[PDB]
Amino acid sequence: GSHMRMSLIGERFTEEEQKLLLNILINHEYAIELLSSEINDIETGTKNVDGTTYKKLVTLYDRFRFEN
Amino acid sequence: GSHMRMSLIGERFTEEEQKLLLNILINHEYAIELLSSEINDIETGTKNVDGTTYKKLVTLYDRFRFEN
Known part of the structure; x- marks a missing residue:
């Protein structure tokens, strides 16, 4: 299975x-480079959407803290 | 001087x-382990305080993304 990343x-x-x-x-x-960039783009960068971004920031830990 | 940590x-x-x-x-x-633990303590742990927890979350990127 090819290692094609999905960010x-x-x-x-x-x-x-x-x-x-x-x-x-x-x-x-590298996933955490995204996580910290992402959480601060919501916190202080003021990105705004429905549960899409919520789910990206909360799934980051849901794998990093637990699975990885 | 000493390396003795301040978390x-x-x-x-x-x-x-x-x-x-x-x-x-x-x-x-290891600061990064705290970063993912910390961001999820805001996101789903629902921490709330007078800029203390804000400052911990925003300082993590303010040195991780930039300096270290």
Whole structure:
């Protein structure tokens, strides 16, 4: 199965992990670079949407703190 | 001088950096583990205080994305 990254899907769950998978398989870990950029783009960058962005920021930890 | 850690001060600027400093000096980086734990403590833990928790979340990126 090809390691084609999907940046932030909103679950990224085992069969959809290829994101976190590619990022751990390469030279340095990378999903958190997105996570911190993303949380601050909502907090102080003032991005605004329905549960889409909520789900990206909360799924980041839902894999990073637990699965990874 | 000493490396003795301060976990989350809410600034951790170059002179107060001994936190981020100790965390990069040991086996692997660790301030980032706090970042994902912290952001989810706001997002789903529903922390609320008079800029203290705001400052912890926004300071994490203010050194992670930029400095370290």
